[model samples]
Target: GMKQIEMKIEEILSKIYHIENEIARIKKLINLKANKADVYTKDQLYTKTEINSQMKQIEWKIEEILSKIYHIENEIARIKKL
Candidate 1:
């Protein structure tokens, strides 16, 4: 059971890293959009829309991960209390 928890913790951390990278990418894209770069415009309205959609999705995923991490930590505390 402890090994399972540890494995899950590692998985969560890995996902967190991926999410952070995606968030950084989204921020860079937004900055580029704000600059009125030709690259952003040439792709059509769908490009910006898609990025915005993905940003929201990633944000939600990050929140979910954080909640899971919190729950796991709480479980560990409960175990220690015994």
Candidate 2:
């Protein structure tokens, strides 16, 4: 039983690490998109509709991942409480 618990903890930790990396990537992408928008705004240049589309896509992905992280964190807390 202890071994099983340890394994489960390890698995959860691995997933948390993966999620952290994904969140980092998402942040980088968001920053890139924001920078592009800023440049266009400053220069009075127009960005393509596709850029807006990509930004929306990234935003949704970030939100989804954040939800998952919250759920996983709750699960970890429950496990610890147990």
Candidate 3:
């Protein structure tokens, strides 16, 4: 139903927000790790790149969930217009 879909949308939105914050944090860490002040090791750089890549993959999933929310919203609106 619309109510359940609404709840699911809210939940995914919350998770996405949290993930965004985490992504920011990881980016910051990666920057710090690579900056002249920190001086990244070759292995450390590879590891950080991998972490960033994984987070980016999750970011794509968030986009997918956002589309699902939009579809539900449109469906509900379509029903209301009837």
Candidate 4:
């Protein structure tokens, strides 16, 4: 059981790491253009709205993962108490 828990934690940590990378990428794409950085290229390829929306979606996913991580850590703590 302990081994399983350790493996699960490892998997969760990897997922969190990937999501953080995605979050950084998302921020880099939209965050800088938050104020319509290039007015002429507004819709040349991608509109600001699309990037902003994606950022929100990714942000929510990050929050969900963080919540799961928090609970898993708490469970680990509780288990160690025994």
Candidate 5:
């Protein structure tokens, strides 16, 4: 049972790493989208404030995911100490 728990812990850790990577990837895309040098055409132009508003929403979503991951990590730690 101890060995099985350790295996599960490793699986959770792998998923956590994957989630972190996905978050980093999204942040890169967000930076590009918000960048002044972004390749959007004049017809599709967005005001800075509008872009900022969307970015803020995305950040909120990411933060929520991160918060959930924090709880998962703590749960894993608790299990390991058992």
Candidate 6:
């Protein structure tokens, strides 16, 4: 009977250890999500709208420069022909 009780006690202790391991796993998962939220909140990342707006402005400036270059090419051709 003493041997039987010792086996039962060990079985319960292992079950308790398993439960603690499971709890630690869950806590780590929760911490990951919390860390992601902290990163976003602490370092205010730009929104898509603002990025797109800046890209559009850059596009407009590029187009303007291209137009001026085209005009210069045309004037150079005219002088060469003359």
Q: Which residue pairs of candidate 4 clash?
A: none
Stretches off by above 4 angstroms in model 2 are 35-82
Best candidate (score: lDDT): 5
Candidate 6 or 5, higher lDDT: 5
Q: In model 1, which range of ten residues has the least summed lDDT?
A: 34-43
Query: What digit string (tens of lDDT, one per residue) describes model 6 on residues 1-82?
Result: 9999999999999999999999999999977675553567525776788889999999999999999999999999999995
Candidate 3 positional error at 32, Å: 20
- Preferred candidate (TM-score higher): 2 or 4: 4
Winning candidate number (TM-score): 6
Better of 3 and 5 by TM-score: 5
Which is superior by lDDT, 4 or 6? Answer: 6
Q: lDDT per model, in order?
A: 0.88, 0.87, 0.89, 0.88, 0.92, 0.89
In order of appearance, the predictions have TM-scores of: 0.43, 0.42, 0.43, 0.45, 0.45, 0.54
User: Candidate 4 residues 1-82, lDDT tens each?
Assistant: 9999999999999999999999999989986664654455534766678889999999999999999999999999999994
RMSD of each: 34.5, 34.3, 34.3, 34.9, 34.2, 5.5
Backbone clash pairs in model 1 (N, Cα, C under 3 Å; residues 3+ apart or in different chains), count: 0
What candidate 3 gets wrong by more than 4 Å, as runs, is: 1-46
Q: Scored by Cα lDDT, where does model 2 land?
A: 0.87
Query: What are the per-residue Cα lDDT tens digits for candidate 1 across 26-66?
Result: 99887765455444555455776788999999999999999
Residue 18, candidate 4: Cα error in Å is 66
Q: Where is the poorest 10-residue window by lDDT in model 3?
A: 32-41
